Amino acid sequence: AQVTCVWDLKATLGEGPIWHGDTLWFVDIKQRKIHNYHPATGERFSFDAPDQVTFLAPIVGATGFVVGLKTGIHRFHPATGFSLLLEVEDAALNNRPNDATVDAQGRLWFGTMHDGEENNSGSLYRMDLTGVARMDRDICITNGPCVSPDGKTFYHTDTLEKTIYAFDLAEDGLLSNKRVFVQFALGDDVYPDGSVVDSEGYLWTALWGGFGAVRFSPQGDAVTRIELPAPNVTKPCFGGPDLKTLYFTTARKGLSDETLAQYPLAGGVFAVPVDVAGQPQHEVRLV
Numbered sequence: 001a002q003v004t005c006v007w008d009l010k011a012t013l014g015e016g017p018i019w020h021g022d023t024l025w026f027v028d029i030k031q032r033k034i035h036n037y038h039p040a041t042g043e044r045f046s047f048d049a050p051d052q053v054t055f056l057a058p059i060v061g062a063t064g065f066v067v068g069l070k071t072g073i074h075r076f077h078p079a080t081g082f083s084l085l086l087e088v089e090d091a092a093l094n095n096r097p098n099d100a101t102v103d104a105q106g107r108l109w110f111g112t113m114h115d116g117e118e119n120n121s122g123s124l125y126r127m128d129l130t131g132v133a134r135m136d137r138d139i140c141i142t143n144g145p146c147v148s149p150d151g152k153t154f155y156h157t158d159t160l161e162k163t164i165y166a167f168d169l170a171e172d173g174l175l176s177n178k179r180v181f182v183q184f185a186l187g188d189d190v191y192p193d194g195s196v197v198d199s200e201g202y203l204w205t206a207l208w209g210g211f212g213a214v215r216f217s218p219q220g221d222a223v224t225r226i227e228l229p230a231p232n233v234t235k236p237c238f239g240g241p242d243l244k245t246l247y248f249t250t251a252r253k254g255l256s257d258e259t260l261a262q263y264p265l266a267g268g269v270f271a272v273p274v275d276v277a278g279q280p281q282h283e284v285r286l287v
């Protein structure tokens with residue numbers, strides 16, 4: 001259908017969109033901002049973060065959000081700012097968190113990455129009521145943790161290796177039976193960024209350098225591709241009254257001034273109606 005640039009925000013690294021409280025929340029990692037977009041009114045709110053902020057997740061029985069800062073996992077509320085919840089990694093790695101999801105058990109799955117985007121020092125983490133467990137390792141840029149509606153399949157992306165993996169997800173939160181789900185052969189400079197799983201179990205993957213997003217069947221076959229006037233698309237997010245408005249964050253990061261003049265809406269927020277609803281956002285169980 002028609003794609004609308006609903007917020008010509010020109011973010012440096014728009015990322016981590018979630019639908020919460022009937023509005024769209026997301027981040028600009030590199031401008032260190034949390035953004036909030038109210039589609040019903042067009043109202044926009046922005047909050048400064050004391051470090052790069054990479055993901056947002058709401059909390060069971062509590063206000064505010066748990067967020068990924070470069071310095072660790074924090075609680076955030078607009079009224080009180082940021083407070084450290086826990087550190088996950090040696091700061092010496094020059095890592096930062098990146099993408100995250102909340103599964104149906106209130107577990108927060110989030111990745112880390114080399115902030116310099118060169119070292120294979122990133123990991124996957126599972127944060128729940130039993131603590132924080134390292135689930136995978138040795139990945140330069142992690143991305144797009146997500147779970148299927150039935151809770152039995154978990155997807156995770158190695159962006160620079162152009163590969164999405166699928167795992168069996170057990171009821172105690174353990175992973176097994178890792179296998180290639182999709183390896184990207186869509187162009188020299190096209191990499192999978194963030195992904196979400198829709199209500200039918202199909203995977204939507206935003207394309208870095210691919211000017212859009214691709215919907216994949218549970219068997220790993222592309223069924224639909226959405227074009228946006230922005231070379232780097234970072235993550236999809238289902239929102240709107242019935243989770244049938246697919247929002248996308250995008251990024252100006254990595255694009256030359258010439259390319260930005262050619263694609264000036266890069267870094268904007270885009271919305272397109274789709275036929276299959278997304279999954280409802282889950283809240284993290286912190287205690």
Ligand SMILES: O[C@@H]1[C@@H](O)[C@H](O)OC[C@H]1O
Nearest residue numbers: 030114115116117253254
């Ligand atoms: O600009 C990028 C910077 O933000 C990142 O930290 O390191 C890689 C650079 O390309």
Ligand SMILES: O[C@@H]1[C@@H](O)[C@H](O)OC[C@H]1O
Nearest residue numbers: 098141143159193194208
């Ligand atoms: O650093 C960026 C990361 O945050 C994004 O998820 O994938 C693209 C990278 O350039």
Ligand SMILES: O[C@@H]1[C@@H](O)[C@H](O)OC[C@H]1O
Nearest residue numbers: 183184185186220221222
């Ligand atoms: O080769 C891959 C193909 O199998 C998948 O369906 O679409 C993505 C391609 O990269």
Ligand SMILES: [Fe+2]
Nearest residue numbers: 099143193194
């Ligand atoms: Fe990402």
